[PDB]
Design a protein around this motif. Structure first.
Motif, PDB file in Angstrom:
ATOM      1  N   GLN A 210       0.849  -1.180   0.000  1.00 32.47           N
ATOM      2  CA  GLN A 210       0.000   0.000   0.000  1.00 32.47           C
ATOM      3  C   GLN A 210       0.893   1.240   0.000  1.00 32.47           C
ATOM      4  O   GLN A 210       1.971   1.228   0.590  1.00 32.47           O
ATOM      5  N   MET A 211       0.432   2.288  -0.695  1.00 25.66           N
ATOM      6  CA  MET A 211       1.114   3.571  -0.754  1.00 25.66           C
ATOM      7  C   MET A 211       0.155   4.660  -0.280  1.00 25.66           C
ATOM      8  O   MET A 211      -1.062   4.475  -0.289  1.00 25.66           O
ATOM      9  N   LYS A 212       0.726   5.801   0.119  1.00 28.29           N
ATOM     10  CA  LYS A 212      -0.047   6.997   0.407  1.00 28.29           C
ATOM     11  C   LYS A 212       0.761   8.206  -0.056  1.00 28.29           C
ATOM     12  O   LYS A 212       1.989   8.149  -0.110  1.00 28.29           O
ATOM     13  N   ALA A 213       0.057   9.293  -0.394  1.00 32.78           N
ATOM     14  CA  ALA A 213       0.695  10.531  -0.809  1.00 32.78           C
ATOM     15  C   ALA A 213       1.787  10.909   0.190  1.00 32.78           C
ATOM     16  O   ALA A 213       1.588  10.799   1.400  1.00 32.78           O
ATOM     17  N   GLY A 214       2.948  11.318  -0.340  1.00 28.80           N
ATOM     18  CA  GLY A 214       4.067  11.775   0.469  1.00 28.80           C
ATOM     19  C   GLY A 214       5.069  10.663   0.788  1.00 28.80           C
ATOM     20  O   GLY A 214       6.119  10.937   1.364  1.00 28.80           O
ATOM     21  N   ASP A 215       4.750   9.415   0.416  1.00 29.55           N
ATOM     22  CA  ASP A 215       5.633   8.290   0.694  1.00 29.55           C
ATOM     23  C   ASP A 215       6.934   8.452  -0.087  1.00 29.55           C
ATOM     24  O   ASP A 215       6.952   9.045  -1.164  1.00 29.55           O
ATOM     25  N   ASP A 216       8.016   7.903   0.480  1.00 34.26           N
ATOM     26  CA  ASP A 216       9.330   7.957  -0.135  1.00 34.26           C
ATOM     27  C   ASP A 216       9.291   7.156  -1.434  1.00 34.26           C
ATOM     28  O   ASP A 216       8.901   5.989  -1.432  1.00 34.26           O
ATOM     29  N   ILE A 217       9.698   7.796  -2.535  1.00 28.59           N
ATOM     30  CA  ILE A 217       9.581   7.204  -3.858  1.00 28.59           C
ATOM     31  C   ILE A 217      10.632   6.108  -4.034  1.00 28.59           C
ATOM     32  O   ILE A 217      10.446   5.197  -4.839  1.00 28.59           O
ATOM     33  N   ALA A 218      11.720   6.192  -3.259  1.00 29.67           N
ATOM     34  CA  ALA A 218      12.843   5.274  -3.367  1.00 29.67           C
ATOM     35  C   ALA A 218      12.651   4.028  -2.500  1.00 29.67           C
ATOM     36  O   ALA A 218      13.465   3.105  -2.575  1.00 29.67           O
ATOM     37  N   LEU A 219      11.590   3.989  -1.679  1.00 26.36           N
ATOM     38  CA  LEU A 219      11.443   2.929  -0.690  1.00 26.36           C
ATOM     39  C   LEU A 219      11.212   1.582  -1.377  1.00 26.36           C
ATOM     40  O   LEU A 219      11.759   0.574  -0.943  1.00 26.36           O
ATOM     41  N   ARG A 220      10.420   1.562  -2.456  1.00 27.21           N
ATOM     42  CA  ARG A 220      10.086   0.318  -3.137  1.00 27.21           C
ATOM     43  C   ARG A 220      11.362  -0.424  -3.541  1.00 27.21           C
ATOM     44  O   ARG A 220      11.497  -1.619  -3.286  1.00 27.21           O
ATOM     45  N   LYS A 221      12.307   0.297  -4.151  1.00 29.44           N
ATOM     46  CA  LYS A 221      13.518  -0.321  -4.668  1.00 29.44           C
ATOM     47  C   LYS A 221      14.451  -0.726  -3.523  1.00 29.44           C
ATOM     48  O   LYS A 221      14.999  -1.827  -3.532  1.00 29.44           O
ATOM     49  N   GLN A 222      14.643   0.166  -2.546  1.00 34.37           N
ATOM     50  CA  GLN A 222      15.550  -0.111  -1.442  1.00 34.37           C
ATOM     51  C   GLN A 222      15.044  -1.304  -0.633  1.00 34.37           C
ATOM     52  O   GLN A 222      15.820  -2.185  -0.278  1.00 34.37           O
ATOM     53  N   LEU A 223      13.741  -1.329  -0.335  1.00 32.29           N
ATOM     54  CA  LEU A 223      13.168  -2.446   0.396  1.00 32.29           C
ATOM     55  C   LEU A 223      13.420  -3.748  -0.366  1.00 32.29           C
ATOM     56  O   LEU A 223      13.851  -4.734   0.231  1.00 32.29           O
ATOM     57  N   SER A 224      13.178  -3.741  -1.684  1.00 32.20           N
ATOM     58  CA  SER A 224      13.299  -4.938  -2.509  1.00 32.20           C
ATOM     59  C   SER A 224      14.741  -5.443  -2.519  1.00 32.20           C
ATOM     60  O   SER A 224      14.976  -6.636  -2.353  1.00 32.20           O
ATOM     61  N   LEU A 225      15.693  -4.521  -2.711  1.00 40.29           N
ATOM     62  CA  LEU A 225      17.113  -4.849  -2.726  1.00 40.29           C
ATOM     63  C   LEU A 225      17.549  -5.397  -1.369  1.00 40.29           C
ATOM     64  O   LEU A 225      18.346  -6.336  -1.317  1.00 40.29           O
ATOM     65  N   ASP A 226      17.045  -4.798  -0.280  1.00 35.00           N
ATOM     66  CA  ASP A 226      17.353  -5.282   1.058  1.00 35.00           C
ATOM     67  C   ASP A 226      16.870  -6.722   1.212  1.00 35.00           C
ATOM     68  O   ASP A 226      17.594  -7.553   1.752  1.00 35.00           O
ATOM     69  N   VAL A 227      15.657  -7.012   0.724  1.00 35.84           N
ATOM     70  CA  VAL A 227      15.089  -8.349   0.827  1.00 35.84           C
ATOM     71  C   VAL A 227      15.912  -9.332  -0.004  1.00 35.84           C
ATOM     72  O   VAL A 227      16.239 -10.416   0.478  1.00 35.84           O
ATOM     73  N   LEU A 228      16.238  -8.961  -1.248  1.00 38.25           N
ATOM     74  CA  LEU A 228      16.976  -9.850  -2.138  1.00 38.25           C
ATOM     75  C   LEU A 228      18.349 -10.176  -1.549  1.00 38.25           C
ATOM     76  O   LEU A 228      18.849 -11.290  -1.725  1.00 38.25           O
ATOM     77  N   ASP A 229      18.950  -9.197  -0.860  1.00 42.45           N
ATOM     78  CA  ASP A 229      20.223  -9.390  -0.181  1.00 42.45           C
ATOM     79  C   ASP A 229      20.076 -10.393   0.966  1.00 42.45           C
ATOM     80  O   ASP A 229      20.876 -11.319   1.070  1.00 42.45           O
ATOM     81  N   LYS A 230      19.051 -10.215   1.811  1.00 48.76           N
ATOM     82  CA  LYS A 230      18.822 -11.092   2.953  1.00 48.76           C
ATOM     83  C   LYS A 230      18.555 -12.524   2.491  1.00 48.76           C
ATOM     84  O   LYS A 230      18.978 -13.470   3.149  1.00 48.76           O
ATOM     85  N   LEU A 231      17.855 -12.678   1.359  1.00 47.51           N
ATOM     86  CA  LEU A 231      17.541 -13.990   0.810  1.00 47.51           C
ATOM     87  C   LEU A 231      18.779 -14.626   0.179  1.00 47.51           C
ATOM     88  O   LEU A 231      18.772 -15.822  -0.099  1.00 47.51           O
ATOM     89  N   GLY A 232      19.809 -13.818  -0.098  1.00 46.93           N
ATOM     90  CA  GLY A 232      21.007 -14.300  -0.770  1.00 46.93           C
ATOM     91  C   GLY A 232      20.802 -14.449  -2.277  1.00 46.93           C
ATOM     92  O   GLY A 232      21.585 -15.115  -2.950  1.00 46.93           O
ATOM     93  N   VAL A 233      19.752 -13.815  -2.811  1.00 39.29           N
ATOM     94  CA  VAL A 233      19.461 -13.888  -4.231  1.00 39.29           C
ATOM     95  C   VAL A 233      20.312 -12.848  -4.957  1.00 39.29           C
ATOM     96  O   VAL A 233      20.789 -13.093  -6.061  1.00 39.29           O
ATOM     97  N   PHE A 234      20.483 -11.682  -4.331  1.00 38.08           N
ATOM     98  CA  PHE A 234      21.265 -10.604  -4.910  1.00 38.08           C
ATOM     99  C   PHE A 234      21.970  -9.873  -3.772  1.00 38.08           C
ATOM    100  O   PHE A 234      21.458  -8.879  -3.263  1.00 38.08           O
ATOM    101  N   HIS A 235      23.139 -10.400  -3.378  1.00 38.68           N
ATOM    102  CA  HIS A 235      23.927  -9.838  -2.293  1.00 38.68           C
ATOM    103  C   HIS A 235      24.430  -8.448  -2.663  1.00 38.68           C
ATOM    104  O   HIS A 235      24.830  -8.217  -3.799  1.00 38.68           O
ATOM    105  N   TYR A 236      24.411  -7.540  -1.682  1.00 37.37           N
ATOM    106  CA  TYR A 236      25.068  -6.250  -1.803  1.00 37.37           C
ATOM    107  C   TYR A 236      26.558  -6.465  -2.043  1.00 37.37           C
ATOM    108  O   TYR A 236      27.147  -7.412  -1.525  1.00 37.37           O
ATOM    109  N   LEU A 237      27.148  -5.585  -2.857  1.00 43.44           N
ATOM    110  CA  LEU A 237      28.586  -5.559  -3.055  1.00 43.44           C
ATOM    111  C   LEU A 237      29.248  -5.093  -1.749  1.00 43.44           C
ATOM    112  O   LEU A 237      28.564  -4.379  -0.981  1.00 43.44           O
TER     113      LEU A 237
END
Length: 237
Positions: A210-237
Motif C-alpha cells: 500500500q502507498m499513500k501521498a508523500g511516501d518515499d519514492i525510493a522505498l520500493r527499490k531499497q526495500l526490494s534490494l534489502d530483501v533480495l540481499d537477505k535472501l542471498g538472491v542478490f547480495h550487496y557488493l
C-alpha cells in the motif's frame, strides 16, 4: 529458517501493508506483513509498460530504436525517448502513445491471448493500467516476468529479448537485476510495485504494498534490494 526471519523483521518496521513474492520456476515464496496481498488483484500501474512494450513491438507498432518525440507539452519527461529510455524513466505519456497506436481492439485480444491479469481494458485504451479496470495479482506478475526472463512468453524471442534489456538495472559480478517500479495513485487504496528478476538460474520477484501521498519514492527499490540481499538472491557488493 533464520533467513526467513531476517526478511520478516525488515517488514516489521514498515507500517504499510506489504507482500514480497519470489518465484524460481518451481516454488512460490511469500514474505511481508500481509501475505494475502499475493493473491489479491491490483492495477499494474507502470509495471504494465512490460506487456505494453511486448505487444507494441510484436505487432509492429514501434521498434526499440524508434524515437518518441516530445510534443512540447510539459510533463524530466520533457524530451525525446526510445521505449527503453521511457521504460527506465517510466515515462507514462510515451507508453500512452504506444497504447494508442495499438488501439483497443488489438490491446484487448492481445491481453486475452497472453492471459494477462483479468484482461479488462474498459473504454480508454491509454488509461486502463493507471485507473483500472485491468488488475493482476503479485503472483501473476512474478510468473509473467519469470517467463520473460526465460523467453517463454507467447511473443517473438527477439521481442522478449529487447524488452528484457529495457528492464536491465544493474549487475553484480555475473548476477543481473531486471526491474520495473509502479505506483497506482489514481486508485484507492494506492498500490506500489517493484517487479523483476535476478538472472544468476532465475529468481523472479514482486514487491506489492500500500502507498499513500508523500511516501518515499525510493522505498520500493531499497526495500526490494534489502530483501533480495537477505535472501542471498542478490547480495550487496
Amino acid at each position: 529458517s533464520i533467513i526467513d526471519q531476517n526478511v520478516q523483521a525488515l517488514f516489521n518496521e514498515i507500517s504499510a501493508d506489504a507482500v514480497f513474492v519470489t518465484y524460481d520456476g518451481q516454488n512460490i515464496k511469500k514474505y511481508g506483513t500481509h501475505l494475502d496481498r499475493a493473491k489479491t488483484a491490483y492495477i499494474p500501474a507502470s509495471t504494465f509498460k512490460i506487456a505494453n512494450a511486448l505487444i507494441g513491438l510484436e505487432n509492429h507498432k514501434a521498434t526499440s530504436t524508434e524515437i518518441f518525440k516530445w510534443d512540447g507539452k510539459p510533463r524530466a519527461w520533457d524530451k525525446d525517448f526510445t521505449l527503453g529510455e521511457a521504460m527506465q524513466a517510466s515515462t507514462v505519456p510515451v507508453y500512452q502513445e504506444l497504447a494508442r497506436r495499438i488501439g483497443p481492439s488489438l490491446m484487448q485480444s492481445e491481453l486475452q491471448r497472453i492471459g494477462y491479469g483479468n484482461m479488462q481494458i474498459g473504454t480508454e485504451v491509454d488509461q486502463f493500467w493507471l485507473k483500472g479496470p485491468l488488475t493482476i495479482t503479485p503472483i501473476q506478475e512474478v510468473k509473467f516476468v519469470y517467463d520473460l526472463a526465460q523467453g517463454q512468453l507467447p511473443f517473438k524471442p527477439e521481442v522478449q529479448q529487447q524488452v528484457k534489456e529495457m528492464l536491465y538495472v544493474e549487475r553484480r559480478g555475473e548476477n543481473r537485476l531486471y526491474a520495473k517500479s509502479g505506483w497506482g495513485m489514481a486508485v484507492d487504496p494506492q498500490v506500489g510495485w517493484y517487479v523483476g528478476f535476478v538472472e544468476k538460474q532465475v529468481v523472479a520477484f514482486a514487491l506489492n504494498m500500500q502507498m499513500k501521498a508523500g511516501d518515499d519514492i525510493a522505498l520500493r527499490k531499497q526495500l526490494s534490494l534489502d530483501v533480495l540481499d537477505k535472501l542471498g538472491v542478490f547480495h550487496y557488493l
